């Protein structure tokens, strides 16, 4: 709600924070974001619907300082705001641009829907928002290189969930030509005060998955996340 001016204000703020992405027309960015989903049925959104926005949003970024995450948004952002040379998805133009927002159009109108928008599990899965996030996560993972770090909530009872966004799209789109190692950090939110959580079956599953792709798997516990920062 107040979505268009919010996208424009976020884009303009990001222009100022980064004089590298100053080379950006934010009305152009909003035009492409809009042309992605408006006047379409909100269950037929493909990924090429968003590709003009992806082209306007592709961004020079140190590929060896990417921090993925799955179900820990807050501590990952806390981290990337102290280790100021590492970046999450939400530190990009588009991630910063769409974070925590909701949007959807309607077939046969130029009207943005502020009434209701499709839920991903009760209605359909190819809605504007989830497809946007699928798309940007794919591209973000495709940019990564060298040693890629992913942070995981080690009190989530599936420390690595396959049907996660990280598990679904991000693990299978890290390129073995550029990435040598994926190293997980298992955050201890009081769970298993003493046990070694990298020995969890889901971490072993992720180890097998990323090793079928010719990429090394490392892992490391973080027992007390406070003094870690």
């Amino acid at each position: 709600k107040r979505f268009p001016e919010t996208v424009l204000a976020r884009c303009v703020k990001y222009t100022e924070i980064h004089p590298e992405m100053r080379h950006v027309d934010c009305q152009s960015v909003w035009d492409a974001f809009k042309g992605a989903f408006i006047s379409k049925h909100p269950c037929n959104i493909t990924e090429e619907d968003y590709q003009p926005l992806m082209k306007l949003g592709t961004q020079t970024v140190p590929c060896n300082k990417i921090l993925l995450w799955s179900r820990i948004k807050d501590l990952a952002h806390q981290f990337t705001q102290v280790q100021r040379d590492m970046f999450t998805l939400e530190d990009t133009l588009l991630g910063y641009l769409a974070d925590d927002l909701t949007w959807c159009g309607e077939f046969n109108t130029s009207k943005i829907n502020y009434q209701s928008c499709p839920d991903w599990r009760k209605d359909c899965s190819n809605n504007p928002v989830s497809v946007f996030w699928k798309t940007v996560s794919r591209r973000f993972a495709e940019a990564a290189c060298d040693v890629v770090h992913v942070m995981l909530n080690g009190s989530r009872s599936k420390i690595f969930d396959k049907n996660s966004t990280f598990g679904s799209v991000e693990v299978h789109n890290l390129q073995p030509e550029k990435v040598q190692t994926l190293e997980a950090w298992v955050i201890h939110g009081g769970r298993e005060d003493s046990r070694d959580l990298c020995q969890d079956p889901t971490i072993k599953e992720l180890e097998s998955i990323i090793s079928k792709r010719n990429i090394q798997f490392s892992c490391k516990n973080i027992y007390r996340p406070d003094k870690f920062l």
Partner: antibody
Amino acid sequence: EVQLLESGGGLVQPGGSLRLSCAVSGFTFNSFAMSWVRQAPGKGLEWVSAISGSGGGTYYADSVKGRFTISRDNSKNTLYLQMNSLRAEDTAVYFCAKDKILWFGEPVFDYWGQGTLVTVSS
Amino acid sequence: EIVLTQSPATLSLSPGERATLSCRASQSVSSYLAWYQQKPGQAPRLLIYDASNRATGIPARFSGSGSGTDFTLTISSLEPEDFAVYYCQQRSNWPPTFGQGTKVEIKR
């Protein structure tokens, strides 16, 4: 008291192999990447290889690819460097080193072992 | 590979002068440059890391500056124990690399 102590020594024939060891104490071994860094006598420091805290991530210098194998036993607090097909050029003091950084990646070394001389000769 | 060129090969300075040691990079390593001190027979001792931060247990007369491709270590008030070879090291990308080193003699 952070301690890094390398083991053995080394006179090998060219084309032979040997295994360098290093025992650590005074820090959580498996919380850190480690690296082997060589120095020929009278020359500079050349980095050989790096391994992650879990032992799953490894990087090698092009000089030693296909011949050297970095390795690590975390239950024994020990870092290994296996060296096969040793050449005369591989003669050097080999140094154990610990990563200062809290994760795998391009390292800076805050602690070093004392070094072991490896001599490749007939 | 990134090549580090440490610019003064040698140095003989009397105790109490300041030593200015240089380290040039072939491409930009940003701030990812550290300094090590090596005394004869000993292993390197970490002095400075990531351009300007001096490591724990290091005197304040050791200071590091620079970025992009130009870096300097400063030994503000020499002592005869400062005799050593000093190396810079980058960690911008693989592989990590060292300079050829500057050996500094203390005069008397």
